[PDB]
Amino acid sequence: GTAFVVKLRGLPYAVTEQQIEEFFSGLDIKTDREGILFVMDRRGRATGEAFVQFESQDDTEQALGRNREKIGHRYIEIFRSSIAEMKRAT
Numbered sequence: 001g002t003a004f005v006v007k008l009r010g011l012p013y014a015v016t017e018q019q020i021e022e023f024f025s026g027l028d029i030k031t032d033r034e035g036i037l038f039v040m041d042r043r044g045r046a047t048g049e050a051f052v053q054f055e056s057q058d059d060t061e062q063a064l065g066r067n068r069e070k071i072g073h074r075y076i077e078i079f080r081s082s083i084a085e086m087k088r089a090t
Contacts, residue, residue: 002083006063008050009077011038019071020052027062028055037090051086 012019017036021029029035030053039049054060060080067078 003080004054004057004060005081005083005086006052006054006060007079007081007085008052009048009079010074011046011048011050011076012072012074013046013048015046015050015071020050023066023069023071023076024052024063027059029053030055034086037086039089049089051081051090053083053086 008020015038020036035053037051039047039051041047052063054063064078064080066076068075070076
């Protein structure tokens with residue numbers, strides 16, 4: 001379960017959980033507060049990075065296949081990650 005996580009980079013400034021859910025339409029993102037986490041700097045300003053947790057390993061692989069697809073006009077970079085990396089940054 002610890003590798004069913006991806007890290008996103010390049011997000012729009014006005015990005016919302018709804019836009020992330022739409023970008024990963026068809027994939028099962030966890031429903032709790034820890035399904036989607038936006039990364040913040042030490043004063044709470046957004047960095048443009050996020051972590052997304054999926055329910056299954058195959059959904060993580062399909063998410064990685066959406067690397068450089070767009071939200072709005074922004075190209076979204078997607079990297080393999082881990083629960084420990086998500087928890088550290090958030």
